[PDB]
């Protein structure tokens, strides 16, 4: 039962996190122009449809991380590396040690996912009422499902050893 709830969760967390970083509908500011991750597409900006890329230019280390969004992407890279580790349960089975290697990547992506928001909120503010769009809440599901998949992958490793 739990052996199948992990492979379906890896493809439901990686395929869901790659969408949150793709569509640029994270933040809604004010004309009302919806924001994004790498570029914002303006609306009601003296033009019908305009979408231009943002220009970000020892505090310079935070600007490059916000521009080169590696933390919200590194979590997706670890989700696919852990998604193929649990896929190694059929081929080259009876190892009882490759499942533990997936429980580390499933939680290491959650640490790099919460960080990708701290560097995004601190750089956002750095009156004007701004809200979070539906595309920003998708990234939140990429962290909750990253912990349920991190508790279900290690629990199997404990049962296999016991």
């Amino acid at each position: 039962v739990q052996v199948l709830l992990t492979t379906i969760g890896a493809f439901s967390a990686f395929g869901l996190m790659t969408i949150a970083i793709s569509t640029d509908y994270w933040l809604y500011t004010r004309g009302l122009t919806h924001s994004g991750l790498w570029r914002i597409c303006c609306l009601e900006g003296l033009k019908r449809g305009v979408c231009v890329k943002i220009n970000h230019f020892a505090e310079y280390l935070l600007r490059v991380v916000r521009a080169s969004s590696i933390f919200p992407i590194l979590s997706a890279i670890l989700l696919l590396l852990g998604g193929v580790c649990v896929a190694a349960s059929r081929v080259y089975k009876s190892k009882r040690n490759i499942i533990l290697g997936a429980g580390i990547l499933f939680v290491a992506a959650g640490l790099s996912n919460i960080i990708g928001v701290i560097v995004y909120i601190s750089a956002n503010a750095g009156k004007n009422h701004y809200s979070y769009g539906w595309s920003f809440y998708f990234g939140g599901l990429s962290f909750i499902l990253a912990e349920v998949i991190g508790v279900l992958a290690v629990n199997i490793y404990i049962e296999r050893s016991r």
Partner: peptide, 10 residues
């Protein structure tokens, strides 16, 4: 809250 659940799982 997200750091609370993150520390607990770790």
């Amino acid at each position: 809250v997200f750091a609370y659940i993150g520390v607990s799982v770790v």
